[PDB]
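Issue: ligand-bound run for N,2,3-etheno-2-aminopurine - logging full I/O for the record.

Environment: standard queue, default settings, no custom constraints.

Inputs:
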Amino acid sequence: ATPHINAEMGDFADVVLMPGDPLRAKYIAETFLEDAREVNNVRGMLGFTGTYKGRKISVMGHGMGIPSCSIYTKELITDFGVKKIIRVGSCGAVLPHVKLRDVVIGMGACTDSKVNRIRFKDHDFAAIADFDMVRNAVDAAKALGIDARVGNLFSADLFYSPDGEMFDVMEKYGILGVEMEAAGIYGVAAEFGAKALTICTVSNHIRTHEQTTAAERQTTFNDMIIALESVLLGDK
Amino acid sequence: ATPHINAEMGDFADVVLMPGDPLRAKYIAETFLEDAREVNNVRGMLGFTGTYKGRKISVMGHGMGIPSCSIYTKELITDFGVKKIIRVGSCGAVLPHVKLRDVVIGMGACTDSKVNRIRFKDHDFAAIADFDMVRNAVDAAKALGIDARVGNLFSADLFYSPDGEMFDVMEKYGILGVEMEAAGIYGVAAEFGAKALTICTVSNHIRTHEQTTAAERQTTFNDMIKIALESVLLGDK
Amino acid sequence: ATPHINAEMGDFADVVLMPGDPLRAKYIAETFLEDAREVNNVRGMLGFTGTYKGRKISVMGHGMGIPSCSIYTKELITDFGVKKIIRVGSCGAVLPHVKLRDVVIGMGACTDSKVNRIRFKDHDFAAIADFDMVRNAVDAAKALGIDARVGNLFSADLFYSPDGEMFDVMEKYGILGVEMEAAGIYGVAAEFGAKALTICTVSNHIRTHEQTTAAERQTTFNDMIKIALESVLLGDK
Amino acid sequence: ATPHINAEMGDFADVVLMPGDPLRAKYIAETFLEDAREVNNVRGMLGFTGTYKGRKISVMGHGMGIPSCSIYTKELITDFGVKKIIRVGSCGAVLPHVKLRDVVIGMGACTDSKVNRIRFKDHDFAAIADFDMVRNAVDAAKALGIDARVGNLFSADLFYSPDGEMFDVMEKYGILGVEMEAAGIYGVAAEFGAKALTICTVSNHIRTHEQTTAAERQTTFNDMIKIALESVLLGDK
Amino acid sequence: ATPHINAEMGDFADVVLMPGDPLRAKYIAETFLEDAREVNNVRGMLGFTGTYKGRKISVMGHGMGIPSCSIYTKELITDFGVKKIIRVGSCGAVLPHVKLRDVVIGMGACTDSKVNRIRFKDHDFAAIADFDMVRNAVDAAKALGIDARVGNLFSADLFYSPDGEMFDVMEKYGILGVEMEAAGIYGVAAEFGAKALTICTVSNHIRTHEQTTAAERQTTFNDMIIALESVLLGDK
Amino acid sequence: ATPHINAEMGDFADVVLMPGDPLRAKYIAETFLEDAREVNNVRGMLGFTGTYKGRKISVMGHGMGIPSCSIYTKELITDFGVKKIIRVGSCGAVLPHVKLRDVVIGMGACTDSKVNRIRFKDHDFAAIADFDMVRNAVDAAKALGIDARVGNLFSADLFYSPDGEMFDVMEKYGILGVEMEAAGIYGVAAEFGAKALTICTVSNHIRTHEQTTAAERQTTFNDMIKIALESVLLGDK
Ligand SMILES: c1cn2c(n1)ncc1nc[nH]c12
Ligand SMILES: c1cn2c(n1)ncc1nc[nH]c12
Ligand SMILES: c1cn2c(n1)ncc1nc[nH]c12
Ligand SMILES: c1cn2c(n1)ncc1nc[nH]c12
Ligand SMILES: c1cn2c(n1)ncc1nc[nH]c12
Ligand SMILES: c1cn2c(n1)ncc1nc[nH]c12
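Outputs:
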């Protein structure tokens, strides 16, 4: 057991899918995993282990923000044998050609957090996904007939930014989606020698809004959960 | 409703005690409040409203880290008429003369986050509590016979910090507790125009490596809660 | 003797009021102390020791700016047994509801100096006063019938700042007064192990451009001095 | 023409290979392209346009260092309709398991340069390659019987860095190769909306050394150019 | 009158010599200026105007540190018509070949202050003297048979540094003297369009100490006060 | 030999002239030196050693940008006993009174590069020339009937900067010329204990433009080389 996870080695699979919302982890285990057992409830951060097409898989919330997800991904890597983290989340778009319900894969993650500068002697650490995990996700999306955009996310510390001028900057430099975790998870994965990937669905357009239905949005969220099939591709 | 709270104006008291652990908010409402009703469960961040000695009072988790609690404290302040936030958390100690379950009152909060530099044009913003709230908490602690140190906390972004040497610097400058929120809450309170205070219980020593359990963290920090609730009463006078 | 003070251990009281203007220290000693003797004139930085209602008390200028007052507060703390520094200065106001001769108590001090980043590994050090000293000053002000706001000061390196827009940011974040020392004094107190507090009199408004004379700045700020001296008396209890 | 390229729109293919050493451009054009024509000579930075298996390709050196290649890549993109840039060159390795003449593909590039912080309001821009170009290079290498590593480069401003400890940090965080351009090319690509990739062969080990021979550095260069060119044809799909 | 100088246009010469110590300004007026009148005493920061070989010259303290001297040099430039500031001060040496009582001329001034980054959009502003003033000082020292070193000073914010490792850095990069004002004065002079020069005598060796006599040290201080003759050379 | 210079100790004079454009080195050697011999050719960066009025001089180009010239100047100083480096090149002007083909001598060099902050523990290093070399150049120019301005250069990392407002700041603080190397050469000179100077002719005005012709840029280049070479003889005293 670690200070934020009341579990033991073996309780997690060597791959963990992580949404921000602990209730969304419950949704995923119940919708997609067979024989799911709950393996953590400390601080309400529900985590589960079951099987997908016979493959052992865990899913667990990571909370909002780089500091929260850094705790959980660290402890999973160093104390529960986890090799792969797949964040499965929502993001806001700044580019006009990125539409509601697009699937975005973060090959890199920009940030206004200081955590990677602290790690990297105040220089620029390029916070990146594991390439093979990216490729597995692109291929799994193709097999399902979904086109995924691959590029940069931006991991914000302030959901409610006082700036607002920073969204123009993100647009100018081609940021595909704004969320709050990827850069921290990629930093954790480099620091402790594991592999990580962030996939997001566009849940709003920070400029404008666009228009869809609940059924359509929930369909795309389930499409993202690509993540499970990418694991199977990785297993080779 | 706000993007992270499914409630309406009036569901929250004008004062909200906030631990990081939503299960601890649930424990506070069951143990200390009367007629406690649940007013939020979005993302599992349980929030409750009830009364303490007749005073309407809410309690709601804020999650771990400056970005998490920044979301919740903002929405409480801008859409639910919340005037005072009292964070009631845990912290790790670096000073030798600070032992487990000691109560610390962060008049100020150091940080290695960039959020206040982003608000303050890259200068030093002294993240501070409301003075009257600090004094209320000190007086309530004296009336309860509970010791409490008043000083600087350090709000860390990395619970698992790769810079162990920074603990020596925290120690040198008298930091009473390492937690993960205060400096961001004080920044929100200033940005959005309310008042805040962080009280913490020392739950582990970073040097001695003695620590309290996860079950103890959510259900044994009762002195802190009493200080927090009684300090509201003094503030209402 | 230290490199900037020609005196010996015992010449200073354990509490030193310090304005920036050495002529103001001279005025304080003549007007408020009894049996005042001069204990330093190096570089014209006049310092005096006497008694206030029987309590040994010193007063000495610290010069303008964080680097100037850092020298003097350091030497007082490390070679003259000084335990408490009470800065008694002037400040410029940015908030509309803050008028000339208002008294401000800096529980914290923002700054655009780099000195605390250099002490604190480039992180945010919340430069704060001693809590008991702040409360002493608040209580002494109430007993004297003098209003006083408690909050953040901003310690500027550039009196003539080329960034006028930073005043808007100070205003947004509730900065009660722009002066040039508090954040450095609070940093010295923490580094070298003593306690400090800055009290300031609003001597000009940065927006309205109303200002007090240079002669008024050195001889009309009497309410502040009374608060400072009486707060020491409360602290001795 | 532009300040550093004396040519007209249309003289360059939409894909440009860029070695560092400008003398290698003429080599590539004569060894791997058909029907090559000279399209630039300003300050000895020779450029050529030709075909590889019918596909229009240009090649031109970029100089050493982020400021140099930032100039040439910008002008190609904004004034010559270039859509893809492939930098081909050498790097030094810090990882014990990365060996001399290994092929490294920079999906990302760390840097100690300030150029991206100037672009990105002093936040962290992740300087990344175009994903399809990365994958094209991996597959083209595979088809040539070459396993290629994919991960982070580090683009150093100072070949002779005074901070020997940074190489240990690079190794801790998995940096595959040290060179001097990738992060700057990636930033320009993002700034003006084109696509870029850096491929490097390991020419030396910062740990120990025992560098490579002459015919080995000839075989290995040819493999890298072959990989880059076949990757373009894969990108055409 | 300005907020820190109780004087009027005309009261100062268009060149001001400035030591840190207001008592040292009094010493200089009394030792070197004819018909000296005191023209400022606000905050005890004594300033004087007299003549040197018939040339009108002022001298005035500037206090310790960049923030203090920035106030006084600013107000002198924008409100009293001053064109040239010559700081005349003491510095500590870090180089082993820089000896006690060497005369050091700051063609540039390094600093750990943030004031020039604030002025210069967070980039590196090279805080420099006016070249002609440097050359006049070198020539005046030569005519007096004194060899002056010209190079970098370092302007510290903390006389009592918590670092201490920074002195090795200054030594490595050839810093001739450590004081507390030059970089701020050069920043003021660029910002408001005036000219400035810092001359220092080495009053200690931050490593080791060396050994001289009071009479010898006071002789070298008077040699520095070079400054007066450099003005006359500047007048052409 | 060094990684970028295939030569031996003694092949270079103790004084090296460095243009940016490497093709200018052969020009200088053939036009102003006697008995010139080729001493380097690695990646087309030709170097030559000869005499000017009996004085041994070398010339070799430095590439564009701080990282490029930092490599070559370092290796010359640490491995070829070089004592003085004179960079000769062009710059852009922001000041209305600085005119095309004016000669500018960089007593100091501002920069938006991070290299000196990496050297100087993130403080402000003033990147400065050697004073005697400055004065030698002024006097040599005077003797040729050329008035030369002396002050600050700005060494830009990005020729194509995304912050158009920085040119206004440069103009406010008196920058005489914008180029891309001076501050980096000055930092290397200080790091390894040698002497350096950058001389520039104004080739364009950032304000407006209306650049210079061909025979004008020929006359002006020759004047700059003449100034640099006569300045060396003045330095020999
Ligand atoms: C603006 C929007 N936004 C954000 N800032 N951060 C995270 C996020 N997730 C969905 N939408 C988001
Ligand atoms: C070491 C300990 N520690 C920490 N670092 N950060 C936050 C925190 N909360 C309780 N204990 C904590
Ligand atoms: C504007 C005003 N102002 C200032 N900036 N800094 C320090 C200070 N002391 C009194 N008044 C002050
Ligand atoms: C150490 C090594 N090294 C470097 N630093 N930078 C660029 C580069 N290219 C090959 N080898 C290199
Ligand atoms: C160490 C020494 N030192 C200093 N730091 N700063 C200014 C100064 N003037 C003389 N000696 C000095
Ligand atoms: C604008 C202009 N400019 C520049 N930025 N950098 C270097 C340079 N050399 C000549 N002209 C230049």
